[PDB]
Amino acid sequence: SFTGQGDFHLLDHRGRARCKADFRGQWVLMYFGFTHCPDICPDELEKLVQVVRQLEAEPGLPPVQPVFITVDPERDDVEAMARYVQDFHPRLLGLTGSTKQVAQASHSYRVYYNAGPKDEDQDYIVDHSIAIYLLNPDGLFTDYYGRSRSAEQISDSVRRHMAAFRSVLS
């Protein structure tokens, strides 16, 4: 008795907070990042935006909506997300939160990011190991992508992930 649908809750880049249930009826691309990457995110977000724009051009392919998610709150803001979305394009979506969100999400859904020690000198932040995930139109996941790729492998992989997950109404 009760559901309780394997939920989640994050802040919207305009000062609200969105639940798992709103995103139903879409394909959604989940990206784990932070508002201060030097030279990985400004490749990959533009690289993925070119794949999203290919799927605006090519008829019958899935409407892949991106979300960018902050992995640590000690350097972010909802107003920083609001810029990080819009100065790329208003088709972006920015999501943020705090410890008892991101920790209980990670306890429910185990995934890699490296919290490091330090003592005296002192570079290092957190490793964000360039993986992304496909969330789908009932609030379930399909599979992963990333590690090292570029648009020509992505559009064919999104076509193959589509041909695996399927429609129905066939």
Q: Which residues are annotated as part of the binding site? A: 37, 41, 128
Of 45 and 52, the one with the shorter C-beta distance to Cu ion is 45
CB of 33 to Cu ion, least distance (A): 6
Of 55 and 132, the one with the shorter C-beta distance to Cu ion is 132
Of 48 and 162, the one with the shorter C-beta distance to Cu ion is 48
CB atoms within 10 A of CB 113: 14
Stretch binding Cu ion (CB under 5 A), from 38-46, 51-59, 96-104, 162-170: 38-46
Of 41 and 102, the one with the shorter C-beta distance to Cu ion is 41
Determine the number of helices (DSSP H) and then strands (DSSP E) in the chain: 4, 9
CA proximity to 84, closest of 53, 45, 118: 45
Binding site listing for Cu cation: 37, 41, 128
Residue 37, interface with Cu ion (CB under 5 A)?
Answer: yes
Residue 40, interface with Cu ion (CB under 5 A)?
Answer: yes
Of 39 and 138, the one with the shorter C-beta distance to Cu ion is 39
CA 66 vs CA 45, 104, 114, 132: distances in Å: 9, 22, 23, 10
CB of 34 to Cu ion, least distance (A): 8
Return the residue of 11, 28, 29, 41 that touches Cu ion, per CB under 5 A.
41
Q: Which residue has the tokens 């030279």?
A: 39
- The dihedral region occupied by 31, where left means phi > 0, alpha psi between -120 and 50, and beta the remainder, is beta
The residues, any chain, with a CB within 8 Å of residue 142's CB and separated by 6 or more, are: 134, 135, 136, 161, 164, 165
CA 115 vs CA 34, 136, 170: distances in Å: 14, 29, 45
CB of 162 to Cu ion, least distance (A): 26
CB of 151 to Cu ion, least distance (A): 17
CB of 27 to Cu ion, least distance (A): 22
**Pairing of β 131-135 and β 27-33:** antiparallel
Residue ranges binding Cu ion (CB under 5 A)? 37, 40-41
